[PDB]
Amino acid sequence: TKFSIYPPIPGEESSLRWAGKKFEEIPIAHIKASHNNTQIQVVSASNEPLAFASCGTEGFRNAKKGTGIAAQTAGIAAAARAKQKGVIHIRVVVKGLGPGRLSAMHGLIMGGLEVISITDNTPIPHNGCRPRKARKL
Amino acid sequence: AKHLKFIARTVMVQEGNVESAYRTLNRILTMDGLIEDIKHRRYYEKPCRRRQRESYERCRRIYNMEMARKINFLMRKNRADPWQGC
Amino acid sequence: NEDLPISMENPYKEPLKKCILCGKHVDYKNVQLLSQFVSPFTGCIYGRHITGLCGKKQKEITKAIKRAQIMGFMPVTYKDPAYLKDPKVCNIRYRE
Amino acid sequence: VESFASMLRHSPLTQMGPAKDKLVIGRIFHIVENDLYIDFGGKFHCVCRRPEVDGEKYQKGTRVRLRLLDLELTSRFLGATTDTTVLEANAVLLGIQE
Amino acid sequence: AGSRLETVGSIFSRTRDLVRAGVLKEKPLWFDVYDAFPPLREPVFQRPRVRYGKAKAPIQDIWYHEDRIRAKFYSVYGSGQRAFDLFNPNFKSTCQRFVEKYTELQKLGETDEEKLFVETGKALLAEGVILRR
RNA sequence: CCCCACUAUGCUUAGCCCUAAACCUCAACAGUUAAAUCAACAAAACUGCUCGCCAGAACACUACGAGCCACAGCUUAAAACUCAAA
Ligand code: FES
Ligand SMILES: [K+]
Ligand SMILES: [Mg+2]
Ligand SMILES: [Mg+2]
Ligand SMILES: [Mg+2]
Ligand SMILES: [Mg+2]
Ligand SMILES: [Mg+2]
Structure with missing residues (x-):
């Protein structure tokens, strides 16, 4: 059967299973990659928070938060605290284009969780709020 | 917000190749213009500057395609000289 | 002299090229057709350099897509998964 | 005497019509x-x-x-009042004539 | 020596004026030949002009009646599988034979374009020329 | 100038104010591509007809007068002295 990049539809039945569970039952790792900090929160399919870790909660301070190593450490900590609640497979939802966008997932993988899908949900307004002025540096 | 989740901007991983899935998602977001839109929306671009930039890119593209067409058209003559010596 | 050339419109003039939707009606309720010109992952409307449509039909498709989206017929942020297996008419590849 | 008009009318090149394909x-x-x-x-x-x-x-x-x-093979390019010619025809070689 | 103003008059006019003015002692070797057998146009320099507005070149497109028939043939039966031999001054393509038969039928019958086409096809098939639509 | 916070203001309604590199820096209509095309550059060169405007620089998007829902405002807009330039 040809592999499909497109996620399974909850309505249409599919044979894809991960440890006996369907796609819409897998826990979700929400990564927020800001410019100066990265946040990782693992939740269940029913939105029950299982684990949380950020670069600031792992001791990094000021500009050290906005680095790849800090995001990797936060991902490792979140993966550990989630594995302590029975999480193996996760669906990744990344938000933002910060330096920890990929390092957080690297940490999550290195912590023992298996990624089955990657989703981007960065806020893209269709021209809503007016952004701030450009810096004159 | 009011849409179904895990349908938009979503890529499934094949055989545990997470890096490949991420690079494919990056290609998709860049091709659909989402990445440049996000990067441009960080600060406000004035309407006059936006119009100038759009005109500049349009004319740049037109000129580049025309020059490429000219070079490809004149590339046919670049072969071994058939009348060497004379 | 009978062999002299005669004034005449070009008989070998090839028929002028047509877009795939020429002569067909674009309706906002035909979500299946309108879904063939949007990105599967973001729902963004493809430009004419990708769709290959003429300006008139490009405008028609754009207006129909916006009308269907605002009237509760078409999703905005993604292509409806039911139309993911329809014929591909857009010149775009994600190597996916 | 055969005039040039008759020669052009009955020339094989004229009879061929369009040269494409x-x-x-x-x-x-x-x-x-x-x-x-x-x-x-x-x-x-x-x-x-x-x-x-x-x-x-x-x-x-x-x-x-x-x-x-x-x-x-000719083509008018941007900023040119006259076409640029390579002084060659375009054809595809099919094989030898038996 | 003669004047080097190539943009004023022609070589003949300049040489003639300089000879009559006494600047040139003797006429050049070509002057008598030019005078006896002049060109159709005096070779005077002119700057080519770009046309604008409704000004158009007077060059006409070369068309013949049979071209219509040829077009329809090339649109119906397509290009003949037989190859053209342009080196032969009297080459006859399948389309040319179709044209000749069409004209003979027109001169020996009525003028109905579709009927002429169909009957011409019947006649060529009767002669034994393959014609795949 | 960089970071944070927050006003007038950007928004709607009813009135004002009447200014912009308000520029394609090309006045409106009609016509021509023939002449040496043509100072230069910009944006190929011209013709007919009409309205508006301009006659060295600066003084001066100024002073005075007049008009204006404008009162540190807008339109129109000089002169004296000075210079051989601009
Ligand atoms: S080409 Fe005719 S409608 Fe598009
Ligand atoms: K301007
Ligand atoms: Mg303007
Ligand atoms: Mg006027
Ligand atoms: Mg006026
Ligand atoms: Mg003055
Ligand atoms: Mg004043």
Whole structure:
């Protein structure tokens, strides 16, 4: 059967299973990659928070938060605290284009969780709020 | 917000190749213009500057395609000289 | 002299090229057709350099897509998964 | 006496009409390594690559079958009042004339 | 020596004026030949002009009646599988034979374009020329 | 100038104010591509007809007068002295 990049539809039945569970039952790792900090929160399919870790909660301070190593450490900590609640497979939802966008997932993988899908949900307004002025540096 | 989740901007991983899935998602977001839109929306671009930039890119593209067409058209003559010596 | 050339419109003039939707009606309720010109992952409307449509039909498709989206017929942020297996008419590849 | 108008009207080139996708017979008159210069009766010759199949058979004076695409390759470029010409025809080499 | 103003008059006019003015002692070797057998146009320099507005070149497109028939043939039966031999001054293509038969039928019958086409096809098939639509 | 916070203001309604590199820096209509095309550059060169405007620089998007829902405002807009330039 040809592999499909497109996620399974909850309505249409599919044979894809991960440890006996369907796609819409897998826990979700929400990564927020800001410019100066990265946040990782693992939740269940029913939105029950299982684990949380950020670069600031792992001791990094000021500009050290906005680095790849800090995001990797936060991902490792979140993966550990989630594995302590029975999480193996996760669906990744990344938000933002910060330096920890990929390092957080690297940490999550290195912590023992298996990624089955990657989703981007960065806020893209269709021209809503007016952004701030450009810096004159 | 009011849409179904895990349908938009979503890529499934094949055989545990997470890096490949991420690079494919990056290609998709860049091709659909989402990445440049996000990067441009960080600060406000004035309407006059936006119009100038759009005109500049349009004319740049037109000129580049025309020059490429000219070079490809004149590339046919670049072969071994058939009348060497004379 | 009978062999002299005669004034005449070009008989070998090839028929002028047509877009795939020429002569067909674009309706906002035909979500299946309108879904063939949007990105599967973001729902963004493809430009004419990708769709290959003429300006008139490009405008028609754009207006129909916006009308269907605002009237509760078409999703905005993604292509409806039911139309993911329809014929591909857009010149775009994600190597996916 | 036959006038020029009659000659043009009854010329094979005139009778051929449009030159696109027309099968013609050409003759090899010059060879430069694997480049074959073929005259098919037009104003310009066409330069073809020696086929990988029975390439040895393609020698000077050989009769070949061609599919004409353009009698002369020209193109007007940006900022030019006159077309730029390569002084060659465009054709595809099909094979040798049995 | 003569004047080098190639943009004023022609070589003949300049040489003639300089000879009559006494600047040139003797006429050049070509002057008498030019005077006896002049060209159709005096070779005077002119700057080519780009056309604008409704000004158009007077060059006409070369068309014949049979071209229509040819077009329809090339649109119906397509390009003949037989190849053209442009080196032969009297080459006859399948389309040319179709044209000749069409004209003979027109001169020996009525004028109905579709009927002429169909009957011409029947006649060519009767003669034994393959014609795949 | 960089970071944070927050006003007038950007928004709607009813009135004002009447200014912009308000520029394609090309006045409106009609016509021509023939002449040496043509100072230069910009944006190929011209013709007919009409309205508006301009006659060295600066003084001066100024002073005075007049008009204006404008009162540190807008339109129109000089002169004296000075210079051989601009
Ligand atoms: S080409 Fe005719 S409607 Fe698009
Ligand atoms: K301007
Ligand atoms: Mg403006
Ligand atoms: Mg006026
Ligand atoms: Mg006026
Ligand atoms: Mg003055
Ligand atoms: Mg004033």
